[PDB]
Design an enzyme around this catalytic site. Sequence first.
Site, PDB file in Angstrom:
ATOM      1  N   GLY A  27      -1.029  -2.441   4.631  1.00  9.94           N
ATOM      2  CA  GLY A  27      -1.785  -1.188   4.654  1.00  9.94           C
ATOM      3  C   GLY A  27      -3.149  -1.231   5.316  1.00  9.94           C
ATOM      4  O   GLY A  27      -3.869  -2.208   5.191  1.00  9.94           O
ATOM      5  N   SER A  28      -3.479  -0.148   6.032  1.00  7.44           N
ATOM      6  CA  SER A  28      -4.748   0.057   6.751  1.00  7.44           C
ATOM      7  C   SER A  28      -4.920   1.541   7.041  1.00  7.44           C
ATOM      8  O   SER A  28      -4.067   2.141   7.702  1.00  7.44           O
ATOM      9  CB  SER A  28      -4.770  -0.707   8.076  1.00  7.44           C
ATOM     10  OG  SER A  28      -5.295  -2.011   7.901  1.00  7.44           O
ATOM     11  N   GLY A  29     -10.069   1.385   3.351  1.00  7.96           N
ATOM     12  CA  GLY A  29      -9.691  -0.031   3.290  1.00  7.96           C
ATOM     13  C   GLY A  29      -8.344  -0.393   3.892  1.00  7.96           C
ATOM     14  O   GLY A  29      -7.625   0.473   4.452  1.00  7.96           O
ATOM     15  N   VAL A  31      -4.902  -3.194   2.801  1.00  4.55           N
ATOM     16  CA  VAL A  31      -4.258  -3.735   1.609  1.00  4.55           C
ATOM     17  C   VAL A  31      -3.333  -4.848   2.039  1.00  4.55           C
ATOM     18  O   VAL A  31      -2.596  -4.701   3.020  1.00  4.55           O
ATOM     19  CB  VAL A  31      -3.398  -2.687   0.866  1.00  4.55           C
ATOM     20  CG1 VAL A  31      -2.714  -3.333  -0.376  1.00  4.55           C
ATOM     21  CG2 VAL A  31      -4.225  -1.437   0.470  1.00  4.55           C
ATOM     22  N   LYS A  46      -6.759  -4.873  -2.216  1.00  2.00           N
ATOM     23  CA  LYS A  46      -7.343  -3.895  -1.318  1.00  2.00           C
ATOM     24  C   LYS A  46      -8.736  -4.353  -0.963  1.00  2.00           C
ATOM     25  O   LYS A  46      -9.544  -4.659  -1.866  1.00  2.00           O
ATOM     26  CB  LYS A  46      -7.353  -2.487  -1.952  1.00  2.00           C
ATOM     27  CG  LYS A  46      -8.230  -1.432  -1.133  1.00  2.00           C
ATOM     28  CD  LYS A  46      -8.139  -0.055  -1.754  1.00  2.00           C
ATOM     29  CE  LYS A  46      -8.924   0.955  -0.914  1.00  2.00           C
ATOM     30  NZ  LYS A  46      -8.950   2.309  -1.546  1.00  2.00           N
ATOM     31  N   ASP A 161      -3.568   6.141  -5.574  1.00  2.00           N
ATOM     32  CA  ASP A 161      -4.034   7.024  -4.507  1.00  2.00           C
ATOM     33  C   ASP A 161      -4.425   6.117  -3.306  1.00  2.00           C
ATOM     34  O   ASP A 161      -5.448   5.436  -3.365  1.00  2.00           O
ATOM     35  CB  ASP A 161      -5.240   7.886  -4.966  1.00  2.00           C
ATOM     36  CG  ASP A 161      -5.663   8.928  -3.888  1.00  2.00           C
ATOM     37  OD1 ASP A 161      -5.169   8.791  -2.758  1.00  2.00           O
ATOM     38  OD2 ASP A 161      -6.478   9.840  -4.159  1.00  2.00           O
TER      39      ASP A 161
HETATM   40  C1  LIG Z   1      -4.667   7.642  -9.490  1.00  2.00           C
HETATM   41  C2  LIG Z   1      -6.162   7.837  -9.654  1.00  2.00           C
HETATM   42  C3  LIG Z   1      -6.424   7.133 -10.960  1.00  2.00           C
HETATM   43  C4  LIG Z   1      -6.500   9.313  -9.602  1.00  2.00           C
HETATM   44  C5  LIG Z   1      -6.875   7.074  -8.568  1.00  2.00           C
HETATM   45  C6  LIG Z   1      -8.032   7.387  -7.854  1.00  2.00           C
HETATM   46  C7  LIG Z   1      -8.289   6.404  -6.913  1.00  2.00           C
HETATM   47  C8  LIG Z   1      -9.471   6.435  -6.014  1.00  2.00           C
HETATM   48  O1  LIG Z   1      -9.703   5.423  -5.385  1.00  2.00           O
HETATM   49  N1  LIG Z   1     -10.272   7.504  -5.846  1.00  2.00           N
HETATM   50  C9  LIG Z   1      -9.552   8.773  -5.603  1.00  2.00           C
HETATM   51  C10 LIG Z   1     -10.393  10.053  -5.615  1.00  2.00           C
HETATM   52  N2  LIG Z   1     -11.178  10.162  -4.358  1.00  2.00           N
HETATM   53  C11 LIG Z   1     -12.082   9.335  -3.745  1.00  2.00           C
HETATM   54  O2  LIG Z   1     -13.254   9.743  -3.607  1.00  2.00           O
HETATM   55  C12 LIG Z   1     -11.766   7.833  -3.804  1.00  2.00           C
HETATM   56  C13 LIG Z   1     -11.620   7.310  -5.244  1.00  2.00           C
HETATM   57  C14 LIG Z   1      -7.423   5.295  -6.834  1.00  2.00           C
HETATM   58  N3  LIG Z   1      -7.507   4.243  -5.970  1.00  2.00           N
HETATM   59  C15 LIG Z   1      -6.458   3.447  -5.638  1.00  2.00           C
HETATM   60  O3  LIG Z   1      -5.234   3.740  -6.031  1.00  2.00           O
HETATM   61  N4  LIG Z   1      -6.627   2.389  -4.922  1.00  2.00           N
HETATM   62  C16 LIG Z   1      -5.683   1.542  -4.400  1.00  2.00           C
HETATM   63  C17 LIG Z   1      -4.784   2.136  -3.475  1.00  2.00           C
HETATM   64  C18 LIG Z   1      -3.796   1.328  -2.884  1.00  2.00           C
HETATM   65  C19 LIG Z   1      -3.788  -0.036  -3.151  1.00  2.00           C
HETATM   66  C20 LIG Z   1      -4.659  -0.643  -4.064  1.00  2.00           C
HETATM   67  C21 LIG Z   1      -4.509  -2.041  -4.289  1.00  2.00           C
HETATM   68  C22 LIG Z   1      -5.389  -2.685  -5.148  1.00  2.00           C
HETATM   69  C23 LIG Z   1      -6.354  -1.900  -5.775  1.00  2.00           C
HETATM   70  C24 LIG Z   1      -6.532  -0.520  -5.564  1.00  2.00           C
HETATM   71  C25 LIG Z   1      -5.645   0.143  -4.694  1.00  2.00           C
HETATM   72  S1  LIG Z   1      -6.147   5.634  -7.980  1.00  2.00           S
END
Ligand SMILES: CC(C)(C)c1cc(C(=O)N2CCNC(=O)CC2)c(NC(=O)Nc2cccc3ccccc23)s1
EC number: 2.7.11.24
Length: 332
Positions: A27-28, A29, A31, A46, A161
């Site tokens: 993935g392209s 942060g 991952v 990530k 997300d």
């Molecule tokens: C589902 C929920 C709880 C509403 C999330 C919000 C955000 C978020 O960053 N926010 C969403 C709302 N909008 C923004 O401003 C960014 C913050 C998530 N972030 C991630 O899911 N991050 C990751 C995505 C894919 C791979 C990953 C691998 C390891 C760790 C994390 C990962 S999950």
Amino acid sequence: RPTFYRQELNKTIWEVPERYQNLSPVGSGSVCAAFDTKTGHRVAVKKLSRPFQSIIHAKRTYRELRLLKHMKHENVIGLLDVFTPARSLEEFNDVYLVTHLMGADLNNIVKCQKLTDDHVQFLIYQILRGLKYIHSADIIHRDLKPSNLAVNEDCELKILDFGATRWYRAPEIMLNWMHYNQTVDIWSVGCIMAELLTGRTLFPGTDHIDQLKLILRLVGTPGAELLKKISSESARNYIQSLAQMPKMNFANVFIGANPLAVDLLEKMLVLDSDKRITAAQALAHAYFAQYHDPDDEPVADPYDQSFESRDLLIDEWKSLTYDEVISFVPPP
Ligand SMILES: CC(C)(C)c1cc(C(=O)N2CCNC(=O)CC2)c(NC(=O)Nc2cccc3ccccc23)s1
Ligand SMILES: CCCCCCCCO[C@@H]1O[C@H](CO)[C@@H](O)[C@H](O)[C@H]1O
């Protein structure tokens, strides 16, 4: 502090603890999948892209870290680890987050397996269970879609997300209402559910206006009760000259489907966000009688998101993000 190693992966530098090996981009942060030698399980790492470039980037970095530290639920992404190579706040410039690798997304599963009714009950049940938890923290997803739903070989699901989106978006968001209740997320679940049932995207819009056109063909043009709540004079005028269009009976549209599934879709895909079923209400719907357990649909601890209203300096957001890296405690 652990021992870090460096490596380049497709024109990116990755510096992680030796703990994590066999990094391969996904993935392209950006991952990478990796193998966590400390557990023997596969992880997704990530790396945040340019986390503190602007005030707005810096706030988003802090947002994501604060959110992920808070989410402790089976159907929502959770943090196994968060680390930085930096030895100090003045050095701090890179952020890495670690979670359990689930092998596939729901989009992948929907393409070459026609799901049974039982599969749909379980997959949508889980999305609702994870959503009940997210909503109970006063968080709204706002971009729920099959590519944001990570699924394992036992079809256990978690919401994340990654960051068209349009095919699953509530019509109020695409008309910039700006309020948005949490049932924008329920609109998305209704689109996902329809597609799990039929094999086909419900509203495959070509662009922004085609998206709304397709939505109104199914659900109908706003009823008097909805139009009565529309404050903006332009909006009302923008609306009153689109085709005077009937609500379709969903029973006629989702021909083969469990009538309980059709009922639930009618309660999700209501134009008026005030009348859409909530995640909690949905979990009690008879479609999920085989999965529902009211003693095992938990809610989140209180979530302080007062930071959202604050207008801070980069280095402020950066020291806050650093604080949270340091205070992190891994799950058991
Ligand atoms: C589902 C929920 C709880 C509403 C999330 C919000 C955000 C978020 O960053 N926010 C969403 C709302 N909008 C923004 O401003 C960014 C913050 C998530 N972030 C991630 O899911 N991050 C990751 C995505 C894919 C791979 C990953 C691998 C390891 C760790 C994390 C990962 S999950
Ligand atoms: C032409 C397409 C019209 C779309 C109408 C969307 C109406 C969504 O529903 C509305 O959502 C708001 C929350 O955003 C609430 O404040 C309103 O009270 C509610 O009626």
